[PDB]
Symmetry: C3
Subunit: 249 residues, 3 copies
Amino acid sequence: MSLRLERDGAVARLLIDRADRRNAFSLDMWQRLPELLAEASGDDALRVLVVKSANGGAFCAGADIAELLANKDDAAFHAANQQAINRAQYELARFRLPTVAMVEGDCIGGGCGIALACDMRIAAPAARFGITPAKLGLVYPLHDVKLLVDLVGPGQARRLMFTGGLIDANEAHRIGLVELLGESEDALVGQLATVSSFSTQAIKSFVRRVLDGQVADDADSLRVFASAFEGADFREGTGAFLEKRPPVF
Amino acid sequence: SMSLRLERDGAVARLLIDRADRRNAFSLDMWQRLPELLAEASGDDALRVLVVKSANGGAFCAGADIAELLANKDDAAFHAANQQAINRAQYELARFRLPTVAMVEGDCIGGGCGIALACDMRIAAPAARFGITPAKLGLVYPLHDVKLLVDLVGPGQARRLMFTGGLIDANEAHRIGLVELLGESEDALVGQLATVSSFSTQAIKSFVRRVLDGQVADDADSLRVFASAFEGADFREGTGAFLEKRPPVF
Amino acid sequence: MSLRLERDGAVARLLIDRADRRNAFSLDMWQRLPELLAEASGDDALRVLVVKSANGGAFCAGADIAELLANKDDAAFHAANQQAINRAQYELARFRLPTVAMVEGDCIGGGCGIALACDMRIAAPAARFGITPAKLGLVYPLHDVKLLVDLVGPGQARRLMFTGGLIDANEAHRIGLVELLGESEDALVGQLATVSSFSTQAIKSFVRRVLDGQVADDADSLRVFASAFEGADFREGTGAFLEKRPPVF
């Protein structure tokens, strides 16, 4: 399959495997993505989801161009495609566990949307980023405009979206589009896999609350904080600390 | 008075600050003039990008006309009118319908920094310097402009600059996100901005403004705007040009 | 005297003085902090508050570990500690005057919280930063999640909070966690102490309104702006300029 899930204990990988079209997404792939997220989310052992190319190279060149051109006069297709992309983007960005995009090549348009929906991004030296709807007279979904502005601010967001020009790995790192430069996700994934999954999931939800406009602590966020002390992970943390050993979460 | 003037050149318009003998400092009449020139530029259907720059290079804008400030220091009526005129100019520049670029080649201070902040993006040449200096005279900065600054550089850097009134150079402005690009000239960027879809740039600019105004999710309107693109002439030109392996002419 | 306040005219110093526990905070230090803020705030001569270690080295290694372990099953302690930390953080972040954190060593967990609640941070070359609740199965308070996201954005915030990994002074500077690199706060403090305190206090409040979600000027903010022209600092600013002398605010 051109989009598949691999589950390897604490780590799952969402793999994009369509090298002959530079990992371009078709409508069926967009529709499939939420199903794979649901499969991954149902695994209690999972600690981190990695999104990456199955074969290195391009991360995702964006829209399937043959599909775009074949359906350029098809209103039903455009509506279905809009909904599928928006669903996929919405769900990926709110996946319960930490998510990492490993970008080793071109990450364009809808591909950039996928990367933006992950919690953090690692860029290898060949990585390139761009958002190109202005080159076809199209718009970017507001959900994804917000993901972009959240990371790089409105100046860089407009620079990228108005021009549709590509930027390289170092510039993406400089402007905050990617958090890390590196050849592999292994080191980061190792760190993410060993911490408390109670903590990561709760903190992830707090960050989302802040991004959705929450300004101060309220009764619920105070309760979530306090609930940690009743949890098994806190008991493992304190027990491990007393025994001078690493906690095993 | 031609201390602020508009040049319209097809797809590109230039809002030129032309008061070299006062280092491009703004007087009240220039603040009044600014939205009038924006209205003229906006009425042009052929326009694709507005560039804000010095007519003569050097200083972009050294801030408030100091002679005017001192002469009117006890004049409450002047202060009221000046506050409202500046706030109108800033508000309108920040919401200009098309892409705007500030080309900064020298000192960009106070209200001058306000103008640069109200553009969509900024390019800084090597001699560009930036500062917000109201704390040196016991003044405040408008909340609208505080927000423009915090949007770009965050509250730590915003407070560093506004509390001290100290200047930063082009490289530090670039590092903290006050300017998006370093360069001697706007020509390359303007060329890119002039040749993309103006349907796209205007719609996207409005989306970014909705996000900055606190919009969190897509709604009926934003979903409609997105869908409307496929009914547009620019999309038809885009796909037609792609099939013919030629550049689109939007 | 683990936490103490020095008042030196225009400059006050909140000094963390517990070197034998790497400046770790106990409950009583958290409770003492707002009392010292109230004392500082009552001084009309004050222009800037500096938060720093009394003895260089670590800024604050985080929670008093012996205290944490001794109270691991004490619900009353957890409630009191949560309340004290949140109050201290809330009040420090809203102190009426400019605040500067001078970080010369490790700044971890609750220590990073204190640093984040200052207006700006200077890091010396040995400074290191980390937020580590995920290593103990705990959450970070939403107020402090917001302080972090405000500075570094959601990507870097999640990188730091999910891994609990430390970053060095240069990376903290690169991602916007600290505003300045330097060995000493003296130059910055000199600059802050000589500007208008009418201006700094008013501007600080405007920045806070923006962080709390204010998007446009309103009657109140227009009024605050206009009120500057009736103030003694504006008269001193213009009078000094006319007399070609430095202003004395």
